[PDB]
């Protein structure tokens, strides 16, 4: 198995939330393969820095509102390491789906 924060699985579905600050925590996380996921980014810091989400092995890059939750929704078909980042590729997080 792979290190990070495991997503937690329910209802159809598997949830794992992630906090906007100074970049993202946890910045490693892990997915099961084949199941739909809710990536909950929870956006704390204002820097423009941090306004936009990137999963780029999944299409993915929308805006984060400050103070709110937004949620990435993918269902990771594949196995392997993926990368997520900000909208100018500065901060960075690694998805793993097993
Ligand atoms: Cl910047
Ligand atoms: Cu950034
Ligand atoms: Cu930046």
Do not use: W
């Not at 423009?48 to 990435?72: K, R, T, W």
């Amino acid at each position: 198995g792979a290190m990070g924060q495991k997503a937690q699985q329910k209802n159809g579905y598997q949830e794992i939330r992630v906090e906007v600050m100074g970049g993202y925590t946890p910045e490693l996380i892990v997915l099961k393969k084949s199941v739909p996921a809710r990536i909950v980014f929870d956006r704390k810091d204002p820097s423009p820095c941090l306004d936009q989400i990137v999963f780029p092995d999944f299409g993915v890059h929308a805006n984060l509102p400050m103070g709110e939750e937004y949620v990435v929704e993918i269902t990771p078909e594949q196995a392997g390491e993926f990368s997520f980042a900000c909208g100018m590729n500065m901060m960075h997080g690694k998805m793993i789906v097993e």
